[PDB]
Design a protein around this ligand. Structure first.
Ligand SMILES: [Cu+2]
Ligand SMILES: [Cu+2]
Length: 130
């Protein structure tokens, strides 16, 4: 209605939006992730992870160290503002976070941290508080 957004990650390593706006009147904001298509989480798995644009490379690098068993994310990574679980086709996950964790004027990025293929890296977008 205003404080949530529906995002799909499909079999072609596509997200359906590459830019999310959070309205500052929202106390909390919700991302409902799903995965169109047929491919399971081991071959074409996606999640949804939110960090500042600045923190993303570090999140990715450490996440990579943490590896597959952790969905390539450092557990409890203080730089991840919010994240979903990993999903494969026919699966769904929602995550709610406090809008107070954002500020205006900052650049946020959302992305799939799960290595899922040739266009895995394009499964990203911006998020902005307004
Ligand atoms: Cu993915
Ligand atoms: Cu991926």
């Amino acid at each position: 209605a205003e404080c949530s957004v529906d995002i799909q990650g499909n079999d072609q390593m596509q997200f359906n939006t590459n830019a999310i706006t959070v309205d500052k009147s929202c106390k909390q904001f919700t991302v409902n992730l799903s995965h169109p298509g047929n491919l399971p989480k081991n071959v074409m798995g996606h999640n949804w992870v939110l960090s500042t644009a600045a923190d993303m490379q570090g999140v990715v690098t450490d996440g990579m160290a943490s590896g597959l068993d952790k969905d390539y994310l450092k557990p409890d990574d203080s730089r991840v503002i919010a994240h979903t679980k990993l999903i494969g086709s026919g699966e769904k996950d929602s995550v709610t976070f406090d809008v107070s964790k954002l500020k205006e004027g900052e650049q946020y990025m959302f992305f799939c941290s799960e290595l899922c293929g040739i266009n895995h890296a394009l499964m990203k977008g911006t998020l902005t508080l307004k």
